[PDB]
Every structure is written in C-alpha cells, then in structure tokens.
Amino acid sequence: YDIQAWKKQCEELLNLIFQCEDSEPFRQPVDLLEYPDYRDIIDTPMDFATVRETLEAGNYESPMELCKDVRLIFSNSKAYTPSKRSRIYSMSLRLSAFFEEHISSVLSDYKSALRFHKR
Ligand SMILES: COCc1nnc(N)s1
Secondary structure, three states: OOOOOHHHHHHHHHHHHHHOHHHHHHOOOOOOOOOOOHHHHOOOOOOHHHHHHHHHOOOOOOHHHHHHHHHHHHHHHHHHOOOOOOHHHHHHHHHHHHHHHHHHHHHHHHHHHHHHHOO
C-alpha cells in the first residue's frame, strides 16, 4: 500500500526500455531536420528522454500520467507511419507490448494503495 512506490518502479521500467534495442527511434525527440513535416501531423511530440526528465523533475503526480505520455510515443509513431514497411513502427509495437506487460502491476498497485489510503 505504498502510495509513492510507482516512481521507482517507473524509473526501473524506463531503464529496461532504454536497454531495449527497440527503443532506439524513441530515446530522444524526433529531429525536425530529418522529418520536416513532423509537426504538421503530430500535435504533441513525446519521447522516452522527455518522460524520464518529467519523472525526475517531480512533474508526474501518478503513474497514469506517465502511462499517457508513453502511450503518446506509440500513437505518434502509428500516426506518422506511411505503411508496415517501417522498422520504426514495428519497433514501436514490440516496445508497446513490453511496456504494457510491465506497467499493468504498477498501475494496479498504485490504484490499490490510493483506495487503501481512503478506506
Ligand atoms: C520516431 O521517429 C519518427 C517516426 N515515427 N514513426 C515513424 N515511422 S518515423
């Protein structure tokens, strides 16, 4: 029932994601010199270094907010991909499966801890 435990659990999951070769396209903001129309399609760029910096600055209040930003990394790639003949989109799908598999207990434990706090 530790209400704060999610933060270190998310730091560890982010470390696992950076170790994954599938995170390579998502470890830093998309370069607009490489993808000049990126902001014409993507309203809110997001990447794993930005998520980690937001977490470390103490600017997430819950793992649900972190999860929303991570899910935006994947939805941005889906929106920006022209077809399945994309190593980057295929990496996003595997990485998303890995993230969802690991974030589920973080979210459940946090929500359980908050319910216990207001029992
Ligand atoms: C992550 O770099 C920008 C891109 N996003 N989806 C692509 N298929 S290329």
